Amino acid sequence: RHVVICGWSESTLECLRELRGSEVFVLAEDENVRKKVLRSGANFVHGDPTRVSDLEKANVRGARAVIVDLESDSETIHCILGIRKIDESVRIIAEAERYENIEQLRMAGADQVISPFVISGRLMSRSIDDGYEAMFVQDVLAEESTRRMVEVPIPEGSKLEGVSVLDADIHDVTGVIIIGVGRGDELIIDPPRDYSFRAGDIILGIGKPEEIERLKNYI
C-alpha cells in the first residue's frame, strides 16, 4: 500500500530515505519543501496535518501507516486526533519532542511514540568511554547496513511452528543472531531454549543479507 508522513523534519527526512522503493505521501504546510521531497522519493501534498480534509487528501484513509512529527508536541497531538477521525485502525507512529508529552500522544491515538532525545540521552550516558553501543544502535537500524536488524514473521504452517528455540537452532543454521521474538504486544529478548515458536510471531534478528535470506527460507 502506501505510507503517509505528516510534517517535514530531520527525522521525517531520514524516514523517507529509509523507505526508498516504497510509495510515500508527505503532508506539510511549507510548500517550499516539494523539490527535496520529490527528489527524496515521495509524493508531496501541500496542506495542514491537523485538518481532516487535508489528511484525507494525503491518502490517510487505508494507509499502511501514518508517521507524525510536527514542530510542536501540541501540533502533533492535534494531527493524531485528526487521523483517528478518518481511520481508527491505521497504525500511527509519532515523535515526541518532550518526555512530558508522551502519554498525551498515546491518549490521542498514537500506537507508538518515539522519543529521539530519550534515546540520544541514554546513548550519551553509554558513550563516556567509547562509542560501540551508539554505533551498534545507529547501524543495525539502517536498511543500508552490511549487518542489520531484520523482522521476519513466522508464517502459518511454518516448519518452526511449535518448535523450540533449541531445536530450531537458528543461529547455526542461518548465521542470524536472534535478539528477540515479538508476540502480541510484547517483545521477548533472547527467548529461552524452551520457548516454542508460533505462527504470527515476529523474529527480531541481526545478520548479513545472505544470512537473512537463509532465515526467511528456513522460516
Give residues in contact with Ca ion (CB under 5 A): 9, 11, 69, 95
Nearer to Ca ion, 16 or 206 (CB): 16
How many CB atoms lie under 10 A from the CB of residue 16? 21
Could you say whether residue 125 binds a second copy (CB under 8 A)? yes
Picked from Ca ion, a second copy, none, the partner binding residue 121 (CB below 5 to 8 A depending on kind) is a second copy
Site map (CB under 8 A) of a second copy, residues 53-92, x = contact: -----------xx-x-x---------------------x-
Distance in angstroms (rounded) separating the CA atoms of residues 182 and 186 = 6
Distance in angstroms (rounded) separating the CA atoms of residues 61 and 25 = 12
Please choose, out of 28-36, 43-51, 77-85, 114-122, the segment that lies near a second copy by the rule CB under 8 A.
Answer: 114-122
Nearer to a second copy, 53 or 142 (CB): 142
Do the Cβ atoms of 34 and 44 come closer than 8 Å? yes
Please tell me the chain's helix, strand, coil percentages from 3-state DSSP, rounded to the nearest 5. Answer: 40, 25, 40
For a second copy, the binding residue among 41, 46, 106, 182 (CB under 8 A) is 182
Strands 148-153 and 202-207: antiparallel
Could you say whether residue 167 binds a second copy (CB under 8 A)? no
The distance from CA 112 to its chain's CA centroid, rounded to whole angstroms, is 9
Check whether 130 is labelled as a binding-site residue.
no
Closest distance of CB 21 from a second copy, Å? 11
Do the Cβ atoms of 172 and 110 come closer than 8 Å? no
For a second copy, the binding residue among 119, 167, 173, 210 (CB under 8 A) is 119
Distance in angstroms (rounded) separating the CA atoms of residues 28 and 48 = 6
Binding-site residues, please? 69, 95, 97
